[model samples]
Target: GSHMTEQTSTLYAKLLGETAVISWAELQPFFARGALLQVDAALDLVEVAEALAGDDREKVAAWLSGGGLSKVGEDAAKDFLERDPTLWAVVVAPWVVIQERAEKATLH
Candidate 1:
């Protein structure tokens, strides 16, 4: 049990690496086309995006049913225009997953 080894990079880590902080203005076109899926701040945006990207039905179904994931609505679209908040986003093929900035108060 004392032996340790380096593990290979996982897709989760890869996608997390690809995630970025972007402005709402840049996301507008995707939202307009209904290609954006909003991930609740309570959930890990990268994990959900990976699930959708990998087509993990069980995980995606649970998230969809548990109400953590859904298409960006017009209300949010308008709100984005009004407030123009910065967002965290990643591309999962046809879907560009996003989460509203939660005002994370500290630096890493």
Candidate 2:
């Protein structure tokens, strides 16, 4: 049986729709402005963007302390400058959330 859809006034659906794949070059400018955020792959990019957009302070602080969310750092910037990998991104007002996909499977 199909579950009934619940309607609500939320931007989750819209944010999901707006999420997209972007290149390092396209986002570098935003990073220069200190408006880019890096989301560890362990978390959903859309959900992070939503939390930021809605100002969920507790949740955001938890993620920050857990090292799951942060400003794009120097090492990451160097890698992007050299490799220019494809990245997942979503915009939530003042911030743009991004995640890096693992290159490939590795043997344990």
Cα RMSD (Å) per model? 9.6, 8.3
Clash counts for all predictions:
0, 0
lDDT, candidate 2, at 69: 88
Q: Which residue runs does candidate 2 get wrong by more than 4 Å?
A: 1-13, 81-84, 103-108
* Cα distance off (Å), candidate 2, residue 79: 3.2
- TM values, all candidates: 0.74, 0.75
> What do the candidate models score in CA lDDT, each in turn?
0.78, 0.77
Q: Residue by residue across 1-108, what tens digits does model 1's lDDT show?
A: 877554555545657677778898898889889999888777877789878888999988898899898888798777655653788878775578888776444356
